[PDB]
């Protein structure tokens, strides 16, 4: 829902959100 202005550009912490 929320914007991914930096959520999409970021490919590091993204795969770390779950872990």
Provide the Cα torsion 10, 6, 18, 2; round to 10°: -150
Cα separations (Å) of 10 from 2, 17, 19? 15, 11, 16
Here the tokens at position 2 are 């929320």
Structure tokens at 10: 């970021």
Check if the beta carbon of residue 14 is closer than 8 Å to that of residue 7. Answer: yes
Helix-strand-coil split of the chain, %, nearest 5: 20, 0, 80
Residues 3/10, Cβ–Cβ less than 8 Å: no
Max Cα-Cα span within the chain: 22
Q: Rounded to the nearest 10 degrees, how much is the dihedral formed by the CA atoms of 13, 14, 17, 18? A: -130
């Amino acid at each position: 829902f929320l914007p991914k202005l930096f959520a999409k550009i970021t490919k590091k912490n993204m795969a770390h959100i779950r872990c």
